[PDB]
Amino acid sequence: NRQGRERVYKILDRIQFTVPHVDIERARYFTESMRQTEGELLTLRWAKALKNVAEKMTVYITPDQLLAGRVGQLGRYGILYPEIDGDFYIEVMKDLPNREKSPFQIDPAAAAILMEEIAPYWEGKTYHEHLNKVLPAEIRGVTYHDERGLKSKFVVSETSSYRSALQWVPDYEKAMKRGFIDIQNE
Amino acid sequence: NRQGRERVYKILDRIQFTVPHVDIERARYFTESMRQTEGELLTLRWAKALKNVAEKMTVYITPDQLLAGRVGQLGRYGILYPEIDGDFYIEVMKDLPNREKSPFQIDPAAAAILMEEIAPYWEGKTYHEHLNKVLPAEIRGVTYHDERGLKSKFVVSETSSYRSALQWVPDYEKAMKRGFIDIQNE
Ligand SMILES: O=S(=O)(O)C[C@@H](O)CO
Ligand SMILES: O=S(=O)(O)C[C@@H](O)CO
């Protein structure tokens, strides 16, 4: 029952069972920075790009939250990582709302920024394109059905072209015990 | 002087103290292939591109030579390596025939292919652009006068943005003793 839990149920009732939106901000300002730092150590470009996101993306306090911070708009939302799979945007964004499995909505203005600003930058630069291009012929057959590698064979499937990395647990205790001033001083 | 050497002097007289031409075919057919193999092992891409040059470039027998083969047009000529310094072409090709030091002439039809088909592929891709981009600030002072690194400070000058490599002596004896079928067979 909801006795004593008016705040959490107020937040949850507003979002429970809505269709999530595609938020473009992280991808947008990540791309904006990465575009200007090509050639530099990758993690240095990355850090610069996250600083650009930190400075420019919308900040949020979810209405009624005791916690501050989101990484996209109100409601249910997801965010984008074109460094992985931006070569799919052209084929896939059109029918995200209609996807039988796990549909998402996207505002026309977000589709416009995505296809005019973001996706054109990542052409020839995504991880997925690189992997598909260089896969040895002896391996292609069990990996991808098609020449662009947009369709898995579902025999020996690669899984690195839909995520950045395996799961991860950062050292949260270190951040709260020291704070980032002290880590930065190190 | 010229007794007994009619052949070499016929050849040499036709070209002595003539103005060398820019020939573009090596660059053109090199670029044409490198454009299609991005992401692959560099020396594999390089070999595909050299095969494209071998299949498509004009072959020549200099008139009256006993030796077959040039890598450019009749007369005195040079060829192009946009992989090094293609970011200079916009600024330098204009002033080439009137360059105080080491002038070169270029057919306007070759110059158009150069500046419309070749040079644009190499934007953001050249060695020189990469070096200039990443050089630590502590070191730019003595290396480059300008932000784009097109002018040496002539204090501590890098020399790798105007040549592919140091001098080199290939093992010619091995080529003539074995042939490339037997080397390919190894
Ligand atoms: O270990 S991973 O392959 O990164 C993910 C798995 O733990 C969750 O699906
Ligand atoms: O050794 S290098 O610096 O490649 C060239 C020098 O031999 C002068 O041509």
From Swiss-Prot, chains A, B:
Assigned keywords, A-Z: Lyase, Organic radical
Annotated binding of (2S)-3-sulfopropanediol, by residue: 163, 167
Segments crossing the lipid bilayer: none
Residues of the full protein shown: 21 to 206 of 824
Taxonomic lineage from the root: Bacteria, Pseudomonadati, Thermodesulfobacteriota, Desulfovibrionia, Desulfovibrionales
Any single Gene Ontology cellular-component annotation: cytosol
The organism of origin for this protein: Bilophila wadsworthia (strain 3_1_6)
Protein family (similarity comment): Belongs to the glycyl radical enzyme (GRE) family.
Gene Ontology biological process terms from the UniProt entry: alkanesulfonate catabolic process
GO molecular function: lyase activity
Function: Involved in the degradation of the organosulfur compound 2(S)-dihydroxypropanesulfonate (DHPS). Catalyzes the radical-mediated C-S bond cleavage of DHPS to form sulfite and hydroxyacetone. Can also catalyze isethionate desulfonation, but with much lower efficiency.
Source domain of life: Bacteria
Protein name as it appears in the record: (2S)-3-sulfopropanediol sulfolyase
